[PDB]
Amino acid sequence: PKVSVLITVTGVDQPGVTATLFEVLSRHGVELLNVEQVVIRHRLTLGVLVCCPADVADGPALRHDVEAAIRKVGLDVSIERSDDVPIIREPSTHTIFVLGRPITAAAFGAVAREVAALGVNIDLIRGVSDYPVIGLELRVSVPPGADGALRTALNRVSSEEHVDVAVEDYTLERRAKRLIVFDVDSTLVQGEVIEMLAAKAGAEGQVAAITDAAMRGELDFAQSLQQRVATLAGLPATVIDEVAGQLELMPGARTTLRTLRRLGYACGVVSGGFRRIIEPLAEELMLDYVAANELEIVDGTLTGRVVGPIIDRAGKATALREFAQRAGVPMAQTVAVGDGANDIDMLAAAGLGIAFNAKPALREVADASLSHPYLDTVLFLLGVTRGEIEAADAID
Amino acid sequence: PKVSVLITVTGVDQPGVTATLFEVLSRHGVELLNVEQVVIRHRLTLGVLVCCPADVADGPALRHDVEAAIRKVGLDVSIERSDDVPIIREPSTHTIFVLGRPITAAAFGAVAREVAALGVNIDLIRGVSDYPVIGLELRVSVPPGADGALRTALNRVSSEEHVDVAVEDYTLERRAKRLIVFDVDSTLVQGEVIEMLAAKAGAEGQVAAITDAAMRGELDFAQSLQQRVATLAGLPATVIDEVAGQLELMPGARTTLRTLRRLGYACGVVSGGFRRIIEPLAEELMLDYVAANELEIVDGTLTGRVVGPIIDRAGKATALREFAQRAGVPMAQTVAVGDGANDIDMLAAAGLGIAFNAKPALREVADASLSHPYLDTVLFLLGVTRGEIEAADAID
Ligand SMILES: [Mg+2]
């Protein structure tokens, strides 16, 4: 080891190639500086960087020994002086997730096009899921200052080509995500509980109308809440237990929460909804934190008011901050998932803010958006694969 | 998309290949099922699995369009019906770390040999460090029930070929490690504080002798502690502050702790040593938990006793369990790092037990061993790379 040599093996993968190459190398005076190997669709690449004595690199003995052993079995091999060559590759700066059902070639092509345009190198591509959505990951190296430009390009691509596209910082700190919060209505839970309550008063129509306006950001949250809850005035509080029982989880929600617990996540919900409905479900799903509003009840009857203070847009963010503090988790390591303008400050406050089948106003400011009715696609954005999830679930 | 096709591109890497391939594919009716791409030492492999109409896969139009575009620029491409082909690869079951200074080809060759013998498939190899030690990772798929056999083979290889070799479960749960404890003397800190104390009494020699015996497991811990501390009887308690100031961290310790905090680890020390020495240093290093013994002091003078109960071998384990409980971390997600037989139950109790420049008795039962005087090599065993550490440190 005075000078360095690079050995590169390619061809149709076969058993024992790796061991054969190094058993051959061991017969010379060779120390390893770096090894890289993968098989993709039965294509092997094995790159080995060694430093051997000056005496050895000058020698066709090493060359012949390697060339003969590799070519004999049917693969190809190259061998060259390195010296100027980098020993270990630098980490990727970002990772890009592409989800779709389907992901067209045109879509992915548009992603690649935008990436290359900004002088972004693609370091790796792999699949992260084949179900319930096709999911692909590109780890990339982005030129400094170009990432803002990159997110913009890819947002345009996402809207035009019908795929979800998320860009995330791939640094150590930023991917040690430890805490997550979900909005409840239309996020963790299907539908709007307040509409289910309003149905019992025969007011479902107007309340659905206002809820939709409020989640689009057209109405101030607090006022929209007071007005909608007013429509409940008179209902017996028994109605809370009924609606609570009719609640169905978002598809994939159980898988999501279960996988997140496996990963050691602190988990919570932040809702402008009602705690008597949310806390039963939260306890059962074994959550770590709840923040919700509260219905005023007099004589076992709903008054049509909520008990202040009212969790509003700023309030959600404040609750995440609070939760993160109780939990000892920096904001950069928090995740928030919501569907409404109700959620904008919570998503913004989060290290990673995820819009889930969301109104435009939320999508507009979210770190990432998800457009299929499967909450587990959240897991793909947290660096988890379908196979990993299924593997862990198989062991029970 | 009625049937599936596999497109595989190989050759010397060039800019815009990825985008070119998909721009070409977009002109046909093609949806993506899976994409995999890497460049190793300028060798590109791009494997793309698509489902195109039955009408299209029968067509030399797609074939010619792809073959022409790829071959024009100098790369090679194959195209074949798949159908029977798996869409996304399953996760690796284990990962193997190889550290050495140097790592000979013979060493690595022996690792590969043992791996292939047990019918273990190598899914990936990469470098994880080039400094202060050469570090390589092999993600592998191990046949069920063969892992015990694998750890044994590789332990033999490790001892015979002069490299550290660790086998770890590569499951979701088992690599979401969230809590770590260090032994202090000869682990986080250089040397044995008790010998530094004994030097002040002119007893360094005998105390060094007993400490060595005790860390090899030849002497019961509690008795070895009482006897050694007895030799301090009479020293003024001022001696505590002096020795404390002479304490030097193990090389790489600051990097280790700093990186672990970036990763959101709960961090602590469990020592049979003395809290008046350890707690000052622990506070400064901003640790989350300390367990230590305590020197008995009368009239500002050491009595030569310790204040019971005495943290012993079982005691260390008990402290880790306690810490894990305060922290809300399951034992499978805990890490312990020690050098002595003093540490055997703590290492055993830990999800990942790491022996650091350790006596044989500790190495014998450890999940993994490390033989170079660099504490940061712990980070490599936790799935961190040198480049990642340097990257995060560069941003300050
Ligand atoms: Mg909502």
Ligand SMILES: [Mg+2]
């Ligand atoms: Mg020790």
